[PDB]
Design a protein around this nucleic acid. Structure first.
Ligand code: BAP
Ligand SMILES: OC[C@H]1O[C@@](CO)(O[C@H]2O[C@H](CO)[C@@H](O)[C@H](O)[C@H]2O)[C@@H](O)[C@@H]1O
Ligand code: MG
Length: 580
DNA sequence: GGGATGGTGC
DNA sequence: CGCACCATCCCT
């Protein structure tokens, strides 16, 4: 049953054909500056395995890799592209990426290796990566014979699966989504990850010093208020101190014991002075462990940069996620944590950070898809939509809108975006399940088109079995017909929010591609560094700021054309903190 | 190594 | 909020 192939010692002409399935294996999860353990090539002439030392030193092979006219089909081409960039080798001509294709066909499948993607088409002549390499502590690269066969089989699978996958994508009207959006985006993300973001490590260390001091003071204060020392970070030990020794009211219980959630503690603060201290303690400890030590651990000491990895094939909405580090959750609400952003700086002297963000892109997309006259008009007038919603649901004038009213209106507006139930709108507004579900009725009276959309989208999800986004991304909702209320309800909420969140994701991605193209045509040195939430972060020579102020927002606002305008705000400064 | 639990962003 | 990513605790 073994698969035939040539374990070559040298690169030959028939290995450099016009089209081929290519495997450039990087086993380490984080591929930055990581080893390439082997190379496999499958084309019309046969199947070949090449040792990286010889192949990556062969002028002809390297030329083939960088020749855009030589088309390659791969799985997770970004991984290979970045690993090669670190070795000073350019990878061009990737016309098909099986990972992205599988992701678009069904993001819920969680395809993470060739075998999983192949299984979608009843192809099983390839082993899953985990079976070949191991899980974790027992992970390792096998001997050449086993390694070569595995890489060749993955290449063979890619070679066979391209047509089948492309055919279904076309049937799904997702062929352009793959070829014109996701694949081109993959190359841009590779560039961003490789470029990295410079970190002021000295600044971070200075902050850590101050935190350790304030932390030591608070922990001691907590021990005196408790009349004893214990592991504050231990929810079990803490629970005993709070709900047994101090007899605080047990308002919330968890699976294994007492609930010590911050919102729970927030309500217990009045009962004992220790609560506020424990809250402050967790605050400080969070910044110290997660955002100071955790960040410092992933900064490359030789370049002083962090090189995140964007997971382009993970979320069910089409949004990107990032790890090592995750720059999509860096503190900003509280000033204490926000200062962390001062440690992210330009990579060159006399350069600055420029950030542009879409203003309410989710609600603008909702206005567009629902075609709600009131909501579209609201955005056409560029009104503060939370104040506007408050005026409508509460039947008051803009001058009668109180700060708390706007806050409540804001929670209602986002309810559908987040995908919360009438229950959720209560757990947030800290009101009753009935009142929470009572404002929604008032909201639908003001925005009948949104109500219509919510009813229509759920019915469409039931009829077709899935919902779609502006650029044809898809999400299957099999639970939509569940006879279990909680399960069905969640599927309905996903039916309602996916076209919103998903379309916003589509637009952001398109904007990145359009921007990258414009920056090149304009010959600007400016370049993308990060994509977080609904914003794009770049760095550029201080001399380019004025041009970027006009160029970036325009490109982002024109990415797509909706029934309402797209609005982009922007800021720039010496650090990320200064650009917001 | 991996369960449960808590916190950050939107 | 759902959901992504981390962190620490603590027992296999
Ligand atoms: C919720 C959920 O989809 C998460 O997986 C996702 O990272 C995230 C990102 C995100 C970005 C921008 C934005 C703007 C308005 C409202 C929301 C609500 C939820 C999420 C989540 C947003 C939002
Ligand atoms: O870019 C990530 C990409 O690779 C996958 C494997 O197919 O994820 C692997 O690499 C990530 C980056 O280090 C890890 O977070 C993840 O645990 C590892 O399996 C895909 O999920 C993704 O599309
Ligand atoms: Mg925004």
């Amino acid at each position: 049953a073994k698969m035939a192939f040539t374990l070559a010692d040298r690169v030959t002409e028939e290995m450099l054909a016009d089209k081929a399935a290519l495997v450039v294996e990087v086993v380490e999860e984080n591929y930055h500056d990581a080893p390439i353990v082997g190379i496999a090539v499958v084309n019309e002439h046969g199947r070949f395995f090449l040792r990286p030392e010889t192949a990556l030193a062969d002028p002809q092979f390297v030329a083939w890799l960088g020749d855009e006219t030589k088309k390659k089909s791969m799985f997770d081409s970004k991984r290979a592209a970045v690993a090669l960039k670190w070795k000073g080798i350019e990878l061009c001509g990737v016309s098909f990426d099986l990972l992205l294709a599988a992701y678009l066909l069904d993001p819920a499948q969680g395809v993470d290796d060739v075998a999983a993607a192949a299984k979608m088409k009843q192809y099983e002549a390839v082993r899953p990566d985990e079976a070949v390499y191991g899980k974790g502590a027992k992970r390792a690269v096998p001997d050449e014979p086993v390694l070569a066969e595995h890489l060749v089989r993955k290449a063979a699978a890619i070679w066979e699966l391209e047509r089948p996958f492309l055919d279904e994508l076309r049937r799904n009207e997702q062929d352009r989504l793959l070829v014109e959006l996701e694949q081109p985006l993959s190359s841009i993300l590779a560039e961003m990850e490789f470029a990295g973001v410079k970190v002021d490590t000295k600044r971070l260390e200075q902050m850590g010093k101050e935190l350790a001091e304030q932390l030591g003071t608070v922990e001691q204060r907590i021990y005196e208020l408790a009349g004893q020392e214990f592991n504050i970070n231990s929810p079990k030990q803490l629970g005993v101190i709070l709900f047994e020794k101090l007899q605080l009211p047990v308002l919330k219980k968890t699976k294994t014991g007492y609930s010590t959630s911050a919102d729970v503690l927030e309500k217990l603060a009045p009962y004992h002075e220790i609560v506020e201290n424990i809250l402050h303690y967790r605050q400080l400890g969070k910044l110290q462990s997660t955002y100071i030590e955790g960040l410092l651990k992933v900064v490359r000491p030789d370049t002083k940069k962090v090189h995140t990895i964007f997971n382009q094939a993970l979320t069910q909405t089409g949004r990107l996620s990032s790890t090592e580090p995750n720059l999509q959750n860096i503190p900003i609400r509280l000033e204490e944590g926000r200062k962390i952003r001062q440690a992210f700086v330009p990579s060159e002297s006399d350069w600055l950070i420029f950030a542009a963000d879409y203003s309410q892109i989710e609600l603008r997309v909702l206005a567009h898809i629902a075609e709600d006259d009131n909501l579209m008009e609201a955005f056409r007038r560029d009104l503060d939509i939370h104040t506007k919603t408050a005026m409508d649901i509460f039947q008051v004038s803009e001058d009668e809108v109180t700060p708390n009213m706007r806050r409540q209106a804001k929670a209602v507006n986002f309810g559908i975006v987040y995908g919360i139930s009438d229950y959720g709108l209560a757990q947030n507004l800290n009101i009753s399940r009935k009142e929470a579900a009572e404002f929604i009725e008032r909201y639908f009276e003001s925005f009948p088109g949104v109500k219509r959309y919510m009813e229509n989208i759920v019915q469409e999800a039931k009829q077709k079995g899935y919902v779609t986004t502006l650029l044809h991304r898809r999400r299957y909702l099999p639970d939509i017909t569940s006879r279990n209320f909680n399960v069905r309800s969640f599927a309905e909420r996903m039916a309602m929010n996916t076209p919103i969140q998903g379309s916003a994701a589509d637009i952001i991605k398109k904007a990145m591609i359009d921007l990258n193209a414009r920056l090149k045509e304009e010959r600007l040195q400016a370049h993308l560094l990060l994509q977080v939430h609904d914003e794009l972060i770049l760095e550029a020579p201080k001399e380019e700021m004025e041009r970027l102020c006009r160029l970036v927002p325009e490109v982002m606002e024109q990415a797509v054309t909706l029934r309402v305008p797209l609005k982009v705000d922007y800021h720039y400064g010496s650090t990320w903190y200064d650009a917001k």
